[PDB]
């Protein structure tokens, strides 16, 4: 969840 | 050794006990004992701002005394000396200004 959001934001 | 040690703290305790005894005797019928019994019968048949203001004034005086005792260190003179130095520095600046006027 948190990692998914992080990688989505950072592309 | 014990007598030498406990002497200073003995009269204080005795004064406390003396208060206790005196109040016990005052909070009493104050009648001689061999007749006091009669009272026990008779009795059983039946059964400001000025001072506070003055105390406040004295409290203000006491606080003033404590503050004066604290301030009596007399070190403020040194501080004054420091201030004097600053004043002297001010003079120098004025002189500089005068020089700016001269130029």
């Amino acid at each position: 969840d948190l990692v998914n959001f992080i990688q989505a934001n950072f592309k | 050794y014990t007598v030498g040690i406990v002497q200073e703290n003995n009269d204080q305790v005795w004064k406390f006990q003396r208060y206790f005894l005196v109040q016990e005797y005052c909070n009493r019928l104050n009648i001689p004992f061999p007749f006091v019994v009669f009272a026990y019968f008779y009795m059983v048949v039946k059964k400001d701002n000025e001072t506070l203001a003055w105390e406040g004034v004295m409290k203000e005086n006491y606080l003033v005394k404590i503050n004066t005792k604290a301030n009596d260190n007399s070190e403020e003179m040194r501080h004054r000396f420091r201030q004097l130095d600053s004043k002297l520095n001010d003079l120098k600046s004025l002189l500089k200004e005068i020089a700016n006027n001269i130029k």
Partner: protein, 513 residues
């Protein structure tokens, strides 16, 4: 890459500041009430002078108390490393954020990534709780973190704060004691924004330059004096740019604050920061004419002398109705000096203590631990005074009057010394109140589980009993009959008893003797 032993991440310069702030605030980090950014050269050369160590330790303590975030290079070289150690110590002795900002390209060891763990130029520090790396461009490790840090600070300065009390804005204070070029660039770009902040005329040499300055030839000669080797090495055009940057910085002085080297007080750091913010709150002109907010800000930070000098004085004509709001806050904030200042600046204490005020105060500010201890003492030991105090506190908790005595009792039961003395200086029955306070403290300590709190309470009771004895000695010396009349004066519902009864019940041999 996330490493724990905290959170680490690799960002791109194109990343928006708002997204980063949302990420930080949502889950890991709490809302910041204040920020400190430490501007220091990334060079490994750093001197641990005792003065600098003390200053930075005090800075870390202030940040911990306020809950402020800390931004730093976080490369484990010189000052930054020390900072990490300090924060570690602080957590060994709440939590403090120690964000560090560095460049991915300027990292020796790279361990791409449940959570990858790496143990080992400019290798990042492990004391920092959070670390952010940004090398979206310039893979050879030029300076790129400065731009992102400036953008994030700019975004933060624009954010509104509900309970900041700084006018709805976050104080951003760039603490800088670094001698590097990038330090000068950061200071300049920060001052270009409405970011008041501080320099110290200490080990930092460019900081010394700025402090001494606070003409092109004079700045040049000062720079040469403080940077002989550095000025010699630099080229002509870059150093002309240096002089331009320094002149631009020196243009504005209200945002620029300095720490005198002579000052040796322990609370100097705070002062500086405070003063800085104060000026930006006043000289900003957004609320310069505003009066209340200035006083609230000066009340938050423990700055009493400045508040007396600036807020008060004859011109303003503040009036009485405005001081009640700040007095109420000062009571909770535990700022006895401000309480005394407000009381002696015209506030009517008697009118201030309203029934609703006392009810709310007792209900939502009485320590639960203290309440439980008082309940246990009243139920188990009981006394002539414990019953009265318990009844009064229960009445105010659920929903003459002697409100001053109630406030004094509230201050006493929380073990507040200066505030208790300040309130005592206002009561009518001073001697009786002191004796009652001593008795109450003795009884509470007799039923207190805490070990050191018992000693503190015993010391406070001894102080109050000595105070009463001295007051009565002065009172009796002044007059013999009125002193005895005061002695026999029956309490008007203080505890139902006079001085003699309280002293004898408290076993105060010194007073009786």
């Amino acid at each position: 890459g996330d490493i724990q032993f905290g959170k680490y991440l690799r960002l791109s310069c194109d990343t928006d500041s708002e997204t980063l702030y949302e990420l930080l605030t949502q889950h890991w980090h709490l809302k910041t009430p204040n920020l400190v950014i430490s501007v220091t050269g990334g060079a490994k050369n750093f001197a641990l002078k005792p003065r600098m160590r003390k200053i930075f330790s005090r800075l870390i303590y202030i940040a911990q108390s306020k809950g402020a975030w800390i931004l730093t290079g976080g490369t484990h070289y010189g000052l930054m490393k020390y900072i990490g150690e300090v924060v570690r110590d602080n957590t060994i002795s709440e939590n403090i954020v120690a964000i560090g900002i560095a460049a991915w390209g300027m990292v020796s060891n790279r361990d791409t990534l449940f959570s990858a763990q790496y143990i080992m130029l400019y290798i990042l520090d492990n004391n920092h709780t959070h670390l952010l790396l940004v090398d979206n461009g310039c893979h050879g490790h030029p300076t790129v973190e400065a731009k992102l840090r400036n953008q994030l600070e700019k975004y933060i300065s624009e954010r509104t704060s509900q309970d900041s009390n700084y006018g709805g804005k976050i104080p951003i204070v760039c603490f800088a004691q670094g001698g590097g070029r990038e330090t000068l660039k950061a200071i300049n770009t920060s001052v270009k924004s409405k970011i008041p902040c501080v320099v110290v005329e200490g080990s930092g040499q460019i900081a010394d330059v700025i402090a001494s300055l606070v003409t092109s030839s004079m700045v040049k000669e000062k720079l040469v004096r403080f940077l002989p080797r550095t000025v010699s090495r630099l080229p002509e055009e870059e150093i002309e740019s240096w002089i331009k940057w320094l002149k631009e910085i020196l243009e504005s002085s209200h945002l620029l604050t300095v720490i005198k080297m002579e000052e040796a007080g322990d609370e100097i750091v705070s002062n500086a920061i405070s003063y800085a913010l104060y000026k930006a709150f006043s000289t900003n002109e957004q609320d310069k004419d505003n009066w209340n907010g200035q006083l609230k800000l000066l009340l938050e930070w423990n700055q009493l002398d400045l508040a007396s000098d600036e807020i008060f004085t004859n011109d303003r004509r503040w009036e009485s109705a405005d001081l009640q709001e700040v007095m109420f806050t000062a009571l909770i904030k535990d700022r006895p000096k401000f309480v005394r200042l407000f009381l002696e600046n015209g506030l009517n204490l008697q009118k201030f203590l309203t029934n609703e005020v006392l009810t709310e105060l007792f209900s939502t500010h009485f320590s639960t631990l203290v309440y439980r201890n008082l309940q246990i003492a009243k139920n188990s030991y009981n006394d002539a005074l414990l019953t009265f105090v318990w009844k009064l506190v229960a009445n105010f908790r659920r929903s003459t009057r002697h409100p001053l005595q109630a406030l004094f009792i509230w201050a006493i039961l929380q073990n507040k010394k200066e505030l208790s003395k300040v309130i005592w200086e206002q009561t009518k029955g001073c001697t009786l109140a002191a004796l009652g306070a001593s008795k109450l403290l003795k009884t509470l300590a007799k039923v207190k589980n805490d070990i050191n709190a018992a000693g503190e309470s015993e010391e406070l009771a001894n102080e109050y009993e000595t105070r009463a004895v001295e007051l009565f000695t002065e009172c009796y010396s002044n007059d013999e009959d009125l002193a005895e009349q005061l002695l026999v004066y029956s309490c008007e519902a203080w505890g139902g008893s006079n001085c003699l009864e309280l002293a004898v019940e408290a076993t105060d041999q010194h007073f009786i003797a």
